[PDB]
Write a protein that binds this ligand. Structure first.
Ligand SMILES: [Mg+2]
Ligand SMILES: [Mg+2]
Length: 664
């Protein structure tokens, strides 16, 4: 069922992806690299005192604070959902090998008994209504770009000036490029305007992953993570093998002279992709206005900020179902890309823009280095983009693609299993739009709060409530998938966008509260994804610009966890045992240094201004801007702080671009 073409780096098709500059050439050739991360300034993730600390703390906390999750996956009591062994990784050292990304997910979906298109006309109307509501009366805004982000294929530039020039040129030439693609001239569109080529595969660390302590043996067991070899990836699983990657860290002693304590493992590695910036810029210019619409008009379903903001919605429900989606991005259906494109064309969107959008979701992928002596291969032919990878992480609208799929998937689940009496309200496009508009505003007896693959489904009092309880029971049983679209189950320890839903004895949403996840505090403080990058002079370009600032927002973020104080005291005690120093004093010093450094970056901040005008969100984002890519949005951050992390193309250039894309 068609193997994807593959080209080695030596091939002209792969050579054309990398411009004639040092950075692009280094990116093409970059071999497998590993090493301890600089967790904090002057501290390596593999420092013997740090690993001794992690061993003592993970063991103590698991012992004293066992998980309090009921038969229905509801968190109660201590607010703990698993053991604390997830911190036991040699950060910066990955599992070997990392996966080869699947060129086609069609067989994967078919074998999982998932649909190859909308099942019924109702579902087809609902997916199409989502497009009409999301993409209709949009307002132009400046195109914001993350500082220090790469332009990837073909230039691999990290320079803001160059990135602004590339983006402005892309908005000027997107029409000409899209029209070339409509003529099947993909090579011309790429050669002339750098729109096409491929996604560049970067493997990112998932710093904490499941580890269990076997009581029988007293030995730790790391969660097996299945990886596809090259053959499996190019054949969509028809040939080759899917096997467990090796998380064994013993190798670090032999290879690097690093002492590996018992029960410490190599990190899980996830595929991440970087899009060709010239293709992403015209997509982002439409994606940002879409987010502004859904986060304003449909704020109920889509705009999530604080634990109390979430709580106010959930408390009004009679039933709250916390769902889980298995491997969202890899299962994301190409038929949805095609349905979205078809509907945008029906709405009157510029065909050239729709073509650029369609192409961004069929693009080839350049595999860097999954393991030593592996990679440097282009999957798919850039002359005719035809891949079915699912959802590419670096596509300009990935969040919206996952949100569109999932919001409708959950609504369909509620209709099928709980609310057949609402089917008569979805007869045609106008009625599908009116119903969805009402549902997304939280005006129906069936409700939801969602973001991509994370959601909480609600039922108020009414006819659907009884069905709601049967659906929850079906999820608990776990024998039948409630959706024809994706693999849905209930979350083991219900949470929404980082906040755990803490139930009491009643196990009802009315008396349940949202609390910060204490395990996430530990993940962020002791297992960061990236090092401090102390050699990157411009802090705003770092993955962790101001790590010290997270101490100032900690109480606001995690203070509501039942065991907050217990954890901080356990940290203090264990850090004293390991370093002979006060962790609290160490973090207070880092907080002071980073507060002072911050004023250099904020125009409104005087030489020693302090954090007085900054919110807890501002502080969490300055310590971890990745939270701005999965948890929060631009509007949640103070304007003077957003400017530290992002730069924009003028609204004058985007306004002119948007006028040419949009209907009448
Ligand atoms: Mg899952
Ligand atoms: Mg969740």
């Amino acid at each position: 069922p068609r193997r994807a073409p593959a080209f080695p780096l030596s091939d002209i098709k792969a050579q054309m992806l990398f411009a004639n500059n040092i950075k692009a050439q280094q990116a093409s050739k970059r071999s497998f690299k590993e090493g301890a991360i600089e967790t904090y300034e002057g501290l390596l993730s593999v420092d013997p005192r740090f690993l001794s600390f992690k061993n003592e703390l993970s063991r103590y906390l698991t012992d004293h604070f066992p998980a309090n999750v009921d038969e229905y996956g509801r968190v109660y009591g201590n607010g703990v959902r698993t053991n604390f062994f997830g911190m036991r990784h040699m950060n910066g050292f990955p599992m070997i090998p990392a996966t080869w990304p699947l060129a086609s997910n069609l067989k994967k979906r078919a074998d999982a008994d998932l649909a190859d298109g909308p099942v019924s006309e109702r579902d087809n109307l609902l997916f199409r209504a989502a497009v009409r509501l999301m993409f209709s009366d949009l307002e132009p805004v400046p195109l914001k770009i993350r500082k220090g982000s790469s332009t990837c294929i073909p230039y691999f530039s990290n320079d803001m000036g160059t990135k602004i020039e590339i983006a402005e040129r892309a908005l000027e030439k997107a029409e000409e490029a899209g029209n070339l693609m409509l003529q099947g001239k993909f090579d011309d569109a790429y050669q002339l305007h750098q729109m096409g080529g491929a996604y560049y595969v970067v493997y990112r660390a998932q710093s904490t992953d499941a580890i269990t302590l076997d009581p029988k043996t007293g030995k730790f067991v790391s969660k097996d993570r299945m990886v596809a070899d090259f053959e499996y990836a190019v054949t969509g699983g028809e040939q080759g093998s899917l096997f467990a990657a090796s998380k064994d860290a013993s190798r670090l002693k032999e290879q690097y002279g690093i002492d590996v304590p018992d029960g410490f493992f190599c990190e899980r590695r996830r595929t991440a992709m970087g899009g060709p910036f010239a293709l992403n810029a015209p997509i982002m210019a439409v994606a940002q206005p879409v987010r502004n619409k859904i986060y304003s008009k449909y704020a109920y379903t889509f705009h999530h900020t604080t634990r109390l903001n979430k709580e106010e919605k959930v408390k009004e429900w009679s039933l709250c179902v916390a769902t889980d989606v298995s491997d969202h991005d890899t299962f994301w259906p190409g038929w949805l890309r095609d349905l979205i494109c078809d509907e945008l064309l029906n709405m009157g969107y510029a065909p050239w823009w729709v073509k650029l959008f369609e192409t961004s979701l069929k693009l080839p992928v350049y595999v860097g280095a999954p393991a030593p002596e592996q990679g440097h291969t282009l999957l798919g032919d850039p002359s005719n983009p035809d891949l079915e990878v699912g959802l590419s992480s670096g596509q300009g609208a990935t969040d919206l693609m996952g949100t569109l799929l999932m919001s409708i998937t959950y609504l369909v689940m509620q209709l099928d299993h709980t609310a057949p009496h609402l089917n008569s309200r979805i007869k045609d496009m106008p009625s599908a739009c009116r119903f969805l508009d009402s549902y997304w505003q939280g005006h129906e007896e069936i409700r939801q709060i969602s973001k991509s693959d994370d959601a909480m489904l609600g039922w108020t009092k009414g006819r659907a409530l009884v069905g709601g309880h049967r659906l929850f029971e079906m999820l608990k049983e776990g024998k039948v998938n409630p959706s024809p679209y994706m693999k849905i189950s209930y979350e083991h320890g219900g949470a929404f966008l980082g906040d755990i839903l803490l139930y009491d004895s009643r196990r009802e949403p009315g008396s349940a509260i949202f609390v910060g996840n204490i395990n996430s505090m530990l993940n962020n403080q002791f297992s960061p994804e990236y090092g401090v990058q102390s050699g990157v002079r411009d802090r705003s370009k770092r993955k962790r610009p101001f790590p010290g600032l997270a101490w100032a927002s900690m109480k606001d973020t995690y203070g509501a966890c039942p065991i907050y104080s217990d954890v901080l005291e356990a940290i203090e005690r264990c850090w004293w045992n390991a370093f002979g120093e006060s962790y609290r004093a160490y973090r207070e010093d880092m907080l002071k240094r980073d507060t002072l450094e911050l004023s250099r970056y904020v125009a409104s901040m005087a030489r020693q201004a302090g954090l007085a005008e900054l919110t807890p969100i501002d502080l969490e984002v300055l310590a971890d801007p990745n939270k701005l890519q999965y948890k929060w949005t631009q509007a949640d951050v103070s304007a003077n702080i957003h400017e530290v992390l992002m730069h924009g193309v003028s609204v004058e250039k985007t306004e002119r671009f948007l006028r040419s894309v949009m209907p009448r």
